[PDB]
Symmetry: C3
């Protein structure tokens, strides 16, 4: 009864799930979870068939549901103070709605070795001046700092941190990653490039908000089967156990 | 008097119009018309010299002029309910401002064979989970479902449908299409690629709103000479009659 | 004492600054300064490692701090009138918040010869109709109209103008430029392309607003060392004097 054709259709399904990862027919994903002091979470899905590239601006990274709006000072009173040094006209030093921490989850067939997580202050300008900005500051080379998580045959990567109370407490970030290519024909080789270029905005960055992590895990993480690690360090991810008829090195 | 030089300058003009289509000097366009229950239309022009790629998020697809705003429930009360199953806190089941139907008009020198119209619910996630999402679900392969419309020598394509009252009644969509290339030198060949890459956001998605189709046809469709088909199935498009000094196969 | 190792570490620093321009490790920048009648400035940084491409829509180009909002007419009353000819329902003919003038500053290692500044009215449509629009109208070929400014070994380019009181007084604009490549290996050659494609949105267009030019020069231009030319024609830019041990042609 282990051998039934129905069981093999189930085997097909799960073999399909593991191979679909490496297949050109799947997406790669980076999810950015932002955790606020009110316990709520704002979440951005970045996604593409072959190449994720996105800026999350300040307005993308602050809490836009439990919003900071003293009915007294317009937004520019505060923005000017995080635009230039001592250039503010705000009685508020730090907005409540700025995130406390983040988690980056890279999943699907990412080549984690190509990932970049470049977090900057409000102006997006690395270093002391624009002409001295480096396109890749050392802390943007985050690949080896991700934790590798495994769930059966599934692999994904997590990177967590605090934004803090300095410049990066008013964050902007650029995130990019490539789909792993285990062979030599480039997904942007001249014979392929136009078909992937046509899909450069499949899909544009997309966000949601949730009242707590626990509620998000039930209503979203599990519902969409998004690999995840909770604050108490529990892995929430689908699990496809490896199927193979021969040994693997 | 048929032969006058002035008439030939007119011939030049119309020969220019037909050949400008196939020329690298023209844009390709996809227009997305969204029709609401109040009879108004929101319209997005997607456009590029060689390669259109765009996401129209939920906020792009709902009616943002005749807006849904009960002065009682914040937007997240409703959004949460179309983010996760049964996760809403809204007394409104379906927003008035969600579109009833759509028309996609692909025109200029599109290769309709490369078009993709991928409509999803709010979360933009095809299938049962992100790791099983297909980059091209069967219904995104819409090319053969477009109707081919001809106006003299001009060719364009239309695809209409209803959003309905299920998941896609809270639509997001990814649209991409390539300019037709009737010969072998790719518009993204290494000798060309950088010049077209420089124009990847020429132009970013752009929208308008109009109180009715009839008013839009007068104030916009005709004014900008955008090929179009009205709800009663009348073609509104410029018409350049073919000019040629010899027979065509 | 001219020869001290400390002085040579200073020489290293400034040699680094000049060579970092031509290095792949720097960004190219286009800044768009928009000057309003209230003397305020809205500023967009466009930036990329190798290829800038951006649309600044109408909502990006109008003053969004000193906002136009008669508590009487919704935005569409005015927008409809700049969408189609005589299609408005506004008692206001021209919004206060539309910019008077602009300056484009191209800096870092731009090849100014590849720049395009295509300014259009509200609809973004060049010419008399979409099928006749040219991807490059003559006035978009702006490269030779930029003024070349030098500050020691630093080179940058400025282009100024008025928006006026016609169609382009309701501006949209597409700006693109490539990083100068003084040799033959293309930054989008197949061996390089995927790494730069991954960084196509590093960074997305980013804006600020400032109450006056003078205040912006202190709080932003100088603070970020952004090359600049003030309204009275004073150059504000860092200055690295050329260092070389041999003569230069
Ligand atoms: N290490 C470092 N952090 C900086 C610097 N400038 C600003 N920061 C910010 O400091 C914050 C985190 O640094 P920590 O040393 O952990 O201190 P913190 O918890 O943020 O609180 P502070 O003591 O106010 O900085 C981040 O927001 C950084 O961006 C800097 O020059 N060096
Ligand atoms: N065919 C199909 N449609 C679905 C499914 N899930 C949601 N829908 C939605 O159903 C809507 C259109 O389906 P129809 O069969 O025409 O029904 P409808 O007019 O939308 O009204 P309903 O009966 O409430 O679905 C779209 O919004 C679809 O996205 C599904 O599993 N299959
Ligand atoms: N030259 C020219 N400008 C046009 C045309 N249509 C609209 N304009 C606009 O005219 C404005 C600048 O032209 P100017 O000749 O300097 O006149 P102006 O200062 O704008 O004031 P007006 O006399 O109302 O046009 C810009 O906003 C142009 O876009 C046109 O067909 N030719």
């Amino acid at each position: 009864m282990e051998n039934s054709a129905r069981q093999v259709a189930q085997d097909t399904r799960e073999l399909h799930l593991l191979q679909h990862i490496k297949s050109d027919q799947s997406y790669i994903y980076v999810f950015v979870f932002l955790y606020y002091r009110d316990h709520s979470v704002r979440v951005w899905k970045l996604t593409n068939p072959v190449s994720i590239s996105e800026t999350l601006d300040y307005d993308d990274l602050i809490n836009n549901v439990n919003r900071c709006k003293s009915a007294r000072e317009p937004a520019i009173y505060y923005r000017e103070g995080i635009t230039g040094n001592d250039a503010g006209d705000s009685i508020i030093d730090k907005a409540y709605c700025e995130p406390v921490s983040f988690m980056i989850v890279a999943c699907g067939d990412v080549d984690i070795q190509t990932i970049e997580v470049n977090i900057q202050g409000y102006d997006e300008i690395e270093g002391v001046g624009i002409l001295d900005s480096n396109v890749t500051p050392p802390y943007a080379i985050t690949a080896t700092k991700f934790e590798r998580k495994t769930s059966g045959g599934y692999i994904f990567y997590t990177y967590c941190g605090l934004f803090g109370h300095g410049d990066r407490g008013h964050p902007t970030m650029a995130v990019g990653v490539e789909k792993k290519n285990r062979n030599a024909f480039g997904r942007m080789h001249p014979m392929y490039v136009a078909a992937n270029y046509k899909r450069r905005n499949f899909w544009a960055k997309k966000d949601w908000w949730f009242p707590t992590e626990g509620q998000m895990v039930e209503q979203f993480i599990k519902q969409q089967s998004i690999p995840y690690v909770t604050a108490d360090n529990v892995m929430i991810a689908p699990c496809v156990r490896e199927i193979r008829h021969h040994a693997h090195y």
